[PDB]
């Protein structure tokens, strides 16, 4: 149905010097593709 996507991103952490990879599900409606035309890069609407 492609209503959901599995996305990865660098989320911030308790310390400003560190970042943590986070995997999470998002609804397709909340997401807009970035026009690199690769289809893999996205941003929140």
């Amino acid at each position: 149905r492609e209503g959901l996507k599995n996305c990865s991103f660098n989320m911030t952490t308790e310390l400003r010097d560190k970042r943590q990879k986070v995997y999470s599900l998002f609804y397709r409606l909340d997401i807009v593709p970035i026009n690199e035309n690769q289809g893999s890069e996205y941003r929140l609407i």
Partner: antibody
Amino acid sequence: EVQLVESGGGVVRPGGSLRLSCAASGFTFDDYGMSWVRQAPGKGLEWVSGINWNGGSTGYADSVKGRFTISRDNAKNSLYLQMNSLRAEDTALYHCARGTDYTIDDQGIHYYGSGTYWYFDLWGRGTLVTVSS
Amino acid sequence: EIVLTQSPGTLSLSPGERATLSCRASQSVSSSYLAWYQQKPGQAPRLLIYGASSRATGIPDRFSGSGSGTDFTLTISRLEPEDFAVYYCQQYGSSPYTFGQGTKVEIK
């Protein structure tokens, strides 16, 4: 439990090609970058190539650059190396090695789970590759 | 491009003696990235130090080191019979990462 297992080794005529693979288990594969390191008998270690956690970054030693390609399949928890235009000089024991689970930006910012191929805390037994007429 | 060199190529000390190894880069090492490894014949190598001075997990205080610029040193406070091995320095600082020629410490 934690291990790396090399496969795909063998004897190949020069000018030919061979694909190597490395199975891995006991840890999250997606969190680490990886490298291949080779050692001829009687010789020291030589870095061959390496790949970051998503395959977005690669690098090759000058001695193999342009003849080798490195790739990975995170879904299969496996690392692959394609070796082309093999030469007698390439004969060595090849080791699969786990890279770091984090990388550092130019700003000094650390990223965890975004692994890279700098240094190796885990090594496999390796597999032999021989090049002969 | 960047080549590491190491000395002495061979060392021979009795067990319990203090020992050091030297590694010198042809070019300066960025951010003290240089790291050290240990190997015995018939075995895959292990990592004693990550970064110039920080020990890997499971590495006792017996192993230590420091350095800057092109010049780095590994120190062993005392040699255990288990510590006789081939040692290497690697540079994570610039592509391609390279391993020095290494040194050997032996009683046999």
